[model samples]
Target: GRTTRDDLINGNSASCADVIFIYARGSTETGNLGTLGPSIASNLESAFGKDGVWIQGVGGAYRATLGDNALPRGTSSAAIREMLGLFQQANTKCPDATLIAGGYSQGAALAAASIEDLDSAIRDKIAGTVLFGYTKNLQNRGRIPNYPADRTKVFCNTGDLVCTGSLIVAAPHLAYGPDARGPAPEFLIEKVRAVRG
Candidate 1:
């Protein structure tokens, strides 16, 4: 419970706020949001304050088995679309708040591609995105298509083979939250101030 650090998929209630954070969990991770989502959310909440940020995570089955850690791309169209609706939901309820996208591993693929599917106007409401161990960074030329590169920040740990666009999970890939908790939230705070101010 975000009574300490709440998340949408863990039976924590949703709230209306100045920032709406929609996230996706890594394949087979606990809850709809994995370790990464709540970490960044707690960090980002510092800037916006309690109940100042709404966090939501995608509930999807990432076929990380034969799926080759590649669910970040295709085969999760419905999940991606559901994420789009979260974006719209944020807009509908909190028109004044800036929306955020956050993800990890295969979830990174889910978040990145979801942006491309959004209607142009709906796209910008998502003021920032922070992804750890992104599997598509090298393939997408450092950003998702049609999304502003400046607003997208992908954090690839050193030697994270997955970041190299490969499926080989490594140690670096597993330890993103500690390294990312600082900069990840800071990036979104900076963007929200610039975009919402």
Candidate 2:
């Protein structure tokens, strides 16, 4: 079975938040909160006030696959369902709240994958998406559905295999939070201001 809001919510304060930021971690991360999730959230909290909602994006299988844990191929869609559940609940609680989502690596892929499946009403609530290290291969293969390119900002550092194309490398993927020091934070702030104005 796919993941649900009950599986991921786990006592987070999401109701009545002016905005909900869903942060999906990479494969093998034990918790929904990962390196990039909290970093981005901290920046957003400063702008949206301390009342913003932060959800640890979970749902992905962990195992040695084809002799490597680096490439866990089949777990994306399930995580998408989990994220979708969170969105549905968040939107229902505060239909007027801005929806901002982003992720790292597999988490980024999961965010991208769930965008199109979202209920139309929910989609309308979303302000923007920020993705880091999303796979170019998946985008090419149509695994990650097309989103509103204007509202989406994809940050793929040069030579990062996941975003560029090639074998998986850990170092490049680890650098996203640090590399994207301003764009993501400002992107969230700008979107929220736009909605408020």
**TM-score of each prediction:** 0.86, 0.78
Model 1 residue pairs with clashes: 2-5, 2-6, 72-109
Mark the regions of model 1 whose C-alpha exceeds 4 Å error after superposition.
1-15, 60-68, 71-75
RMSD of each: 3.3, 5.2
lDDT of 1 at 89: 64
Which candidate number maximizes TM-score? 1
Q: Ten residues in a row with the worst lDDT in model 2?
A: 62-71
Root-mean-square deviation of candidate 2: 5.2
In the range 15-132, model 2's lDDT, one tens digit per residue, is: 4667777666665554555566667766776776765554435443422122232334423445567778877877766676788777666666667667767887887677878878
